[PDB]
Amino acid sequence: GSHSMRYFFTSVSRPGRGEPRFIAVGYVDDTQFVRFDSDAASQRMEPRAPWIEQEGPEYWDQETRNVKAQSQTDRVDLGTLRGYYNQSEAGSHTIQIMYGCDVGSDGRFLRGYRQDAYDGKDYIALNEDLRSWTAADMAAQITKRKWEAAHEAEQLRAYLDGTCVEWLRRYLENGKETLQRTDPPKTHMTHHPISDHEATLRCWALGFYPAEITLTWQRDGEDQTQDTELVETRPAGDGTFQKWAAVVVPSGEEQRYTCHVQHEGLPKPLTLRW
Amino acid sequence: VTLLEQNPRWRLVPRGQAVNLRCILKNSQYPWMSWYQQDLQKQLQWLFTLRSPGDKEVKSLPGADYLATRVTDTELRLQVANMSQGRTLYCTCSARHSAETLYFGSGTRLTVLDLRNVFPPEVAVFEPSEAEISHTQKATLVCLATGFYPDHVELSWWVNGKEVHSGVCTDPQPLKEQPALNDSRYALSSRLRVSATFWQNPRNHFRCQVQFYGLSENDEWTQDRAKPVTQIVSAEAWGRAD
Amino acid sequence: DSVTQKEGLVTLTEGLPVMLNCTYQTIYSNAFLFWYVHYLNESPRLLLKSSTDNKRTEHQGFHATLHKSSSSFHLQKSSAQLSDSALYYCALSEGGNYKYVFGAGTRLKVIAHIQNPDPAVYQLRDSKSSDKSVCLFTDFDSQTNVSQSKDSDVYITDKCVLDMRSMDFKSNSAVAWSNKSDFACANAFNNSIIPEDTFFPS
C-alpha cells in the first residue's frame, strides 16, 4: 500500500508560430493536483485537486517560479538537441521529462526516478543507484557527460529522498480523506450476439480506484490469453476509472467461461459468469 | 583569461546618452546569467536573470533605464539609457538558477559627467625630508596628483622598474579641491616609505604612475586645450646619496 | 527588510576578534545564506555559505554558523589582520526567488597597533621646482584622529597605514599642502588633535 508522486513535463516546439508550448502536470498516486500551461492566461502554477488549494500564496509563488525555471532550461534544450541531432529548424519537436518519488506504506523513501525523451525516443534516464546516468545514443551521451560534471546526479538524489518525500507525505495528509480511499469496482456482465452460432461475453467494471485492476477470462480453469479483448483502463472524469474485457464465445456455452476481477478495494477476487 | 568576460571595462557617459554592455560566458556548464547594479551608495541590487535566447525585458530604476537580451547561451547584452546617476554594473553566472554560489564578472564602471570638464592629472614626486631620515632612519616619499575629473584614476609606485608591494600608502579616497561645487576637480596622494640606506643610493629609481581613465580618440575635443583622453601621467626621482 | 546588517562600519585594532551582524527575514523553508567579500579593486567573491541549522562552516580562518531559530548568520574571525579590511556583503536566497538579496555592506577597517609612537611633521621638496612644498604628519599611533583643514586652500588627507618588512615599522601618516606662500607646516596641521610632544624640527 505504497504511494508515489510523479511530475510529468512536456515541451513541443512551433518554428515561427511563436514560443514553444510547455504543459507540466503533477500526479499524486493516480490523482492530478497541479497544472501549468505556458499558454493559459494565469502564467502561474495552478491547483487541480481541492486538498492542495489550502496552501497559501507562498506555495503558489515558489511553485510558479520553479516550474517557470524548468520551462526555460527546456526552450534552450529544444534548440540544443536541434543542433546535436542535425535537424531542420522548420520542424516541431517534442521533449518529454518525467520524474518522481516512491514512499512506502510507513512513509519511507523507496525509490526515485527520472526519465527524459526526445521526439518520443528514450534519451537519458536516471539509474538504479541514483549515482550514475544512462544515455541512449551518442548524442545524449554528450549530455550525460555534462551532468556528470555539475553533479546533477547527487544533487538530484538529495531532492528525491528529501524535498519530494516530505511534501509527498504532506500531500498524503492534506488529502488523506481523498487520496487514501480505496473504491471497489462495481462489476456486472453484458451479452450481445454477433451471429447465430456466435456470441460475445463482455465483463465490465466501473468506479474503481486506483486504476490497477485485473480482468482475467478463464474457461474452466483456462486463460484466454489468445482469445480475450481488453481495453485501456480509462478515466470516468471524476477521479475513478473504468475498464472492460470481452471474449468471443460459442453460442450456447456462456457458463463454461468465467470472469475474474482482482482489485485492491475488492475483499476477495470476484468470479462472475453468465 | 577567466570564467566571465565583460566589456567595455569603463565608459564616460554624457547625461541622457546610452551605453551597451555585453558579457561572454566562458564555461557552458554555468548557464544561469544575471545582471546586477551597484549604486553610488555602495548598495548591491539584482536586475535580470534570463536563460533562453531571445529574452528581452526592460526595467527602470533611479537614474537609468535598462534593456536586457540573452543573445545565445553565452552572449548576454545590456543597454543602459537615459542615465542620471553613476553606477557599477556586474555580470554573473551560477550553476543553478538559485540556492547556489553566484559568480561575479570584473564589472563595468559607468560615470555620468559633461565631457568638457575632463582634465588629466598632474603628477609630482617629492623627495623625503632630511629631518625624517636623520631622526628615524627612514625615508617617506610623497606623490601628489592634482586637478583631474572624473575621479577614476589608479596610482602605483615603481622601484627599479618593478611595481612595489610594501611601503605603499595610496590614499583611500580622492579629495575635493573645491568642496562647495559638486563638480570640483580632485586630488589623490600616496606614500612610499623605504629605509634610509635605500634612498641614499643614487643607483635606485622611483617612479610614481597615475593611470587616468578618460575619453577615446573616437570622441571629439573642441575647447582650446589638449584632448583629455586615456593616458598615463608619470613623475620620478632617483636616489640621492647624502 | 529581508537582510539587515545593522552595523555599517566596524573599527578595531589588529588582533581583536571580529564579528559582523547579519539578520534576515524569510517566509520560506529554503534558507540559503551567503557571505560575499568585496575588496577595493577586486570583484565580489564568495566567502562562505550554508543552509544547515547549527552547522559551523569555516573557510580561510573566517567562520559563521547558521541559527535558523534567530534568523541569524553572523560572520566571525579570531584575530583581525590588516589584510581583512574590506567591504562585506551578506546575502540570502529565498528559494522561490530567481534573484538574490544583499545587505547594505559592513566595512571592517582594521588599523594598526603602533608599538612605539613617535609623532612628527616633516617637509618634503619638489623634485623639479624646489619652491612647491608638502607637509607630512607621520609616526603617530592609530588612536589620534585627523581633522579636515579649516582653510579651504589648505588640503589635508585622511589617515593612511603603511607596511615595512624592514623590521615591521608599520606606521600611519597623513599629508597636508597648499600653494599659498603663507602656509607653514607648524600651523598647517590645525584643528587637529596632535600630541603635545608632536615632533617639530626647524
Binding site: 534544450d77 546533477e152 544533487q155 524535498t163 | 557552458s28 | -
Partner: peptide, 10 residues
C-alpha cells in the same frame, strides 16, 4: 513540489 534549483542545460 517541483525541483528547487534547475540546473545545467543539456
Amino acid at each position: 513540489v517541483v525541483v528547487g534549483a534547475v540546473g545545467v542545460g543539456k
